[PDB]
Amino acid sequence: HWGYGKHNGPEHWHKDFPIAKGERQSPVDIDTHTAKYDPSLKPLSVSYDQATSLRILNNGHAFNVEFDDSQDKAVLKGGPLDGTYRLIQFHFHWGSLDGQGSEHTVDKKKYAAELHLVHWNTKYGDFGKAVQQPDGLAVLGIFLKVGSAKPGLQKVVDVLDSIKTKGKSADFTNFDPRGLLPESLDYWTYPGSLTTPPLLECVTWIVLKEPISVSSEQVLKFRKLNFNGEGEPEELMVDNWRPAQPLKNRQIKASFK
Ligand SMILES: [Zn+2]
């Protein structure tokens, strides 16, 4: 019964999930001046041409667009990563207002929303095994700002009426996640965690410098989703973000000068 309310929100998670106060929790504030350029970091390789989207699900904390991860169809490699990471799902975090919603911040700036493309290390065979490993996941984080519409997001926006409440799913085939990527793949990277319970410290974070722009109408449709099940009291799914956590003994590295 964790969530994002006053009584069950991020400040309470540590009671069920003591790793919430751990040494490598996410998100964090990215202090751009103190991040270190690392000239040996490789370009990212984002290989999404054979991606197979399957379904979209309202899980009661976000919506997930799920992919076939039973073969190397949509993979992330390079950058800070060793090996091959398969795309399993993406989801967003967003706010009730355009001035908040992101999990990571950049020099304390909050964006309207943040996209997470979640990938697991194929050396561990499945996602459930991967989350138990320090190098199990690679999450590509992309900020959303409100401005012009993002045409590559509209197929997601349009299906949200079909998954309004918790536990609802809908077929969601032939969605191309390349339409959600900014022009530049310049990034910051650091070791961290899942940002939702169980908060496992299994993630190599790769946060893109360049945000994507979405329209007011698009983000408004995110905000009409519900945290609750059908026939339960309506609570709008908004402010489903965890705030920045202490950096502790970590250095954020940049792929760019
Ligand atoms: Zn997330």
Swiss-Prot record:
Changing E103 to A/Q: Strongly reduced CO(2) hydrase activity. Residues 1-256 form the Alpha-carbonic anhydrase domain. It is found in: Cytoplasm; Cell membrane. Optimum pH is 6-8. Changing E103D: Normal CO(2) hydrase activity. Its cofactor is Zn(2+); Co(2+). Substrate binds at T195, T196. The keyword Transmembrane does not apply. Changing Y4H: Reduced proton transfer rate. Changing N64L: Reduced activity. Changing N59H: Reduced proton transfer. The record marks Y4, N59, N64 as: Fine-tunes the proton-transfer properties of H-64. PANTHER family: CARBONIC ANHYDRASE, CARBONIC ANHYDRASE 2. Target of drugs used in treatments against glaucoma disorder and breast cancer. This is Carbonic anhydrase 2. It comes from Homo sapiens (Human). The gene is CA2.
